Symmetry: none
Subunit: 177 residues, 4 copies
Amino acid sequence: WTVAVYCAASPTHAELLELAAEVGAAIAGRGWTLVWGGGHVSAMGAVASAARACGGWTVGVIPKMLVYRELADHDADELIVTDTMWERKQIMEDRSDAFIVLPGGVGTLDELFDAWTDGYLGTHDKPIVMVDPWGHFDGLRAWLNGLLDTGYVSPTAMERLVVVDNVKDALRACAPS
Amino acid sequence: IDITGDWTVAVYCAASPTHAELLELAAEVGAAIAGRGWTLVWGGGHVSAMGAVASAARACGGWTVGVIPKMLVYRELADHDADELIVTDTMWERKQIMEDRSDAFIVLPGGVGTLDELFDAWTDGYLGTHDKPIVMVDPWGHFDGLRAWLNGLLDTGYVSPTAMERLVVVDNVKDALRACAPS
Amino acid sequence: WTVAVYCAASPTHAELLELAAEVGAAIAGRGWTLVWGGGHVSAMGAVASAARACGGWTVGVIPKMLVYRELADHDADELIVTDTMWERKQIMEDRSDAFIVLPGGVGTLDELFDAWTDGYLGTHDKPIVMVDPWGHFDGLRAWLNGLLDTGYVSPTAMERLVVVDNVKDALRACAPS
Amino acid sequence: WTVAVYCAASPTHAELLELAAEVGAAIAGRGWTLVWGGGHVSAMGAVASAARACGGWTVGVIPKMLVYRELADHDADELIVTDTMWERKQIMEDRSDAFIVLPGGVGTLDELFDAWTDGYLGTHDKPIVMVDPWGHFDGLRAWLNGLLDTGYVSPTAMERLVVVDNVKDALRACAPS
Ligand SMILES: [Mg+2]
Ligand SMILES: [Mg+2]
Ligand SMILES: [Mg+2]
Ligand SMILES: [Mg+2]
């Protein structure tokens, strides 16, 4: 059983690093495989470092452009280097049984909306779980609720994304049948 | 010379209809079990698929063990030509003797009794009580409505992928006995 | 008067946990004993927890192999641990005056078909009452109606099972008659 | 790597079955072989059934006299049937790299003191680990501390027996170091 974790690439906020490490540790704890974007910086470094420390298998999928920038975790158990971002996202989706979205920026939002669009349209039934203990995404979810009200997003679309505020509820939402 | 008498297969199958496609299938299974030198276990009836599987096994020189509850003996269903006929007081004793005697299970088209035997085996195999093969044989799509419905339970998390993998479904007898055979 | 409730061991769908809780609360409200498979997860945990919450007595019957997996509800008023699945099913039947079947998977279908065969073969005249508010079992009953038409299932067998879409009609059908 | 588990043959306490299953699952998890007394009853049945359920290999070693009494686990991966109790203990010792002692009675105490004396006198350096979450052995250990106080037991003897209150620390103490 494999969970992809989409999360921040830049900041070092203690609460962010702790949350990401808590998820990596809990995935490894269940004996699940971690898929992530293969970076050593910020939340990406935290989730894979914590999974490996708890004996978890880690699969990093990263485009060569970020390898050339020395942003890759060469301690990944498997490092899949892709020529393009579209191949990175395709391999992460294909390898994973479920998706966790932690606080992040444009790169995290790209991964979130890529998975959500495919899940909503019915390409796959894999859980997509947003984990937001402190309201990082409150402004985004409020704005999307506006789109629900003006007919741009359907209730069915809004249902497809599970939002939890703690790691325990996250792993229960991602767990196998 | 090839071993005989080293393996036993239970066959769960219809007690009522006489459709030709059903009796042909059940006779083909009984003949193939006896042809491998395996013992047949079945629900002990002489009617429908139950009568065909046991008649064909005996006609190919195989041993037949029927296990029938008193309630179905009262309905004049008992195959008195069984090599061993075991009459039980209860359904639970019937299913338990069939399971203990058998190394593998074949499920053919049937109704409520067959489905009882199916789900009873499948639950025990999924919970890990035994690793005996459970093989459904469906050449014509008897069970298509059930399998579509079970796929919807898989999609909504009522049945797991692991559970679905524990049940083998084939459309022919040769593949069925390959799935039942000892390693 | 004792009702056994056969229901889902795995999923946490709100419609399912709500149904199970409603059934447990109603059984307790009649002063009836709840018999169940003795687990604290999914519909099984909700039916028994809700019965005890409303002052009802709960008898859990669970095989050792599930106790090993930490699935036993240690707040059962009586917990019966059996060596086998055949003994679990036989004790739940022997203790019970009626059977309720809620949405479930393979374990629930095993309980349903086991009771239905016992019922159809004249072992007992205990009510067997399927409670299906949202059509969980529609695909199964539609397929069975095809078997009735082609002579694989008898009209006597099909009429042995009561099917209702609500808890009030379900307890009406379970009541001493 | 092979761990022998010495444990209760008689009582069915839920908490005992859960601990034994946790041990068997943890041993199988490491890819270690389980050696045990080959019984299907009580903690003995629990440890072997849980190891096999997690894909572990199980080796039961049982004297003919107990096989006569319908006590042998027919689902042992290897069942070694010995003529005598002394041959049973010798084969269990010879096949194993480490020994775990769970709560038990006279048979368990026999296996404990047999392994402990040989360890102490220097016949082998295999870990002997007592796993006692709830103080099953507190009375025995207090009494052995009295024997240490009066010169009947040496400090070297008392140190030879590792006592832990949880399964993670047990497997750490048993691991090839
Ligand atoms: Mg997409
Ligand atoms: Mg069974
Ligand atoms: Mg019964
Ligand atoms: Mg010794």
